[PDB]
């Protein structure tokens, strides 16, 4: 089975509009059956790749790096890069979809970012609140589901609000599930399990001796996250920098050097039939 | 300043010679002091690079993968692949000890690895008592402390024996610390910790709401581990397999192609040289 999309006809519409800031997203005709729109084609026309569905990730986890340097490099300001990264999310979310993966998380504000100047945190979670509320609608009709992943203390409540309309508007899309990490840290994502299982034993709801690897990940914020497959990050930095960290543990690592504002669904693919010529053995032979 | 032990003279013993099994380790100068004794240089004779010790990783974990595909690919069964790659484990710690290496972690059965055969788990089981029995009194003599790492339950006592008696005849030492990992799982290790914190939380000593990180770190087997600053793995495989989970978390990847019995300290050192050059990231540690 090949659960690409059928190719989009040459006329059907291509993304990213890049003369405008922020990007508009173009109207698509409208599904026959009443269900999600087929997204836009990439504005190259290519087409997604042929990966039979044993051979695709389920789950691709992405580190969207570069940003700063993109714009550093061109003499623009930082926040000019992230602002380019934004089409990059939505083109690589259309071209998850026309490939056929059904998870896709995304590191869009790490918990080291409070190391940052405040002036920069400011702009990111207002950026983060504002690509939320400016993509919900286009999401919600390319039947994407999308909620919020990651820790509460600082983090905005105009953010988490913000993706809270966006999950109950989309909860019942099912083409792809979108883990929109913001404040996300894995090592704290842990904790937080921990502390609700300790909860739970002071409470007397659960014994200490009845505590297995699977009490853990049941206890984990959004317990429906699946094991991440394949694990991306860009501007060639090697690292997971504690993303995902308990569901990435067997995950496949493809390290890209192209920054976050360059990158696209190409480049995605490439990604994904690297993956598919690798066998993983998770312990065994 | 420069933490490497500078070149050995041209007549130091060499390490390894491997035309015979189990490999022969040299007799060494005693040292002044009645101190550790300097490792044998390796069979090529180089001498560890000259790397600032604010530069070096404080911190390697290595996944020591490969051996039954090295004794594949030669028409031999897959286990003795392991038996060579046993000197190689040792030819590692002294190039660590050379190139000033403070911590290095041993992956050398995963809690995945049960998934194997009877036949290959006897083997491995059986293979790493051996490997700790044959090699301890030598380490000990290097100034190595080694101690084992990893989760109880299944673990044969005999290889918990051997590693506990390792332990004991070097928990003195300080040239280096070698983590040994048997039955080591990073989301197992975990769990354990958080089996550990309910049980003081039933007992009324934690409360819930004080469960911080440093709270988890505190309850891992062995809580004086430090992060992971360089993470390698062998046979062109990139994945961390659940190694040094927690403590990985914000560590670089380097994926070396060459299958484990093929290494030698040179290849540690070029990747230690690799990470040493990386540019530091905003916000790093
Ligand atoms: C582009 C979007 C929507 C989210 C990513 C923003 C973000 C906080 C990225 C973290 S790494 P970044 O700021 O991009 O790193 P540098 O190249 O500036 O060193
Ligand atoms: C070298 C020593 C002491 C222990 C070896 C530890 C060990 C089982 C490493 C994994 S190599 P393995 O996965 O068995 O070999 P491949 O199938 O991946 O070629
Ligand atoms: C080195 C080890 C003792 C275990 C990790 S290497 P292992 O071959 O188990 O890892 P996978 O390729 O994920 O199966
Ligand atoms: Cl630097
Ligand atoms: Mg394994
Ligand atoms: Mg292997």
Not at 104 to 123: G, H, M
Not at 240 to 254: R, T, V
Not at 277 to 283: A, D, N
Request: charged content about 25%.
């Amino acid at each position: 089975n090949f659960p690409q999309l059928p190719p989009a006809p040459d006329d059907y519409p291509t993304f990213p509009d890049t003369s405008t800031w922020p990007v508009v997203f173009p109207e698509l005709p409208a599904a026959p059956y009443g269900g999600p729109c087929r997204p836009p084609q990439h504005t190259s026309k290519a087409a997604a790749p042929r990966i039979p569905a044993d051979r695709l990730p389920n789950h691709v986890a992405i580190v969207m790096d570069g940003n700063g340097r993109w714009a550093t490099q061109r003499g623009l300001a930082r926040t000019e890069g992230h602002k380019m990264g934004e089409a990059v999310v939505i083109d690589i979310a259309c071209g998850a979809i026309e490939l056929g993966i059904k998870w896709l998380s995304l590191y869009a504000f790490s918990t080291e970012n409070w190391k940052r100047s405040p002036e920069e945190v400011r702009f990111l979670m207002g950026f983060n609140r504002d690509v939320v509320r400016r993509r919900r609608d286009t999401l919600k009709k390319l039947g994407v589901r999308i909620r919020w992943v990651g820790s509460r203390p600082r983090l905005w409540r105009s953010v988490i609000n913000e993706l809270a309309v966006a999950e109950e508007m989309t909860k019942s899309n099912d083409v792809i599930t979108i883990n929109y990490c913001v404040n996300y840290g894995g090592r704290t994502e842990i904790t937080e399990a921990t502390r609700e299982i300790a909860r739970e034993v002071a409470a007397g709801r659960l014994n200490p001796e009845r505590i297995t690897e699977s009490t853990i990940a049941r206890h984990l914020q959004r317990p429906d996250i699946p094991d991440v497959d394949l694990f991306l990050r860009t501007s060639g930095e090697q690292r997971s920098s504690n993303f995902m960290l308990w569901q990435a543990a067997y995950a496949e690592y493809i390290f890209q050097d192209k920054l976050w504002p360059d990158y696209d669904r190409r480049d995605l693919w490439a990604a994904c039939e690297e993956y598919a010529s690798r066998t993983r053995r998770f312990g065994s032979a």
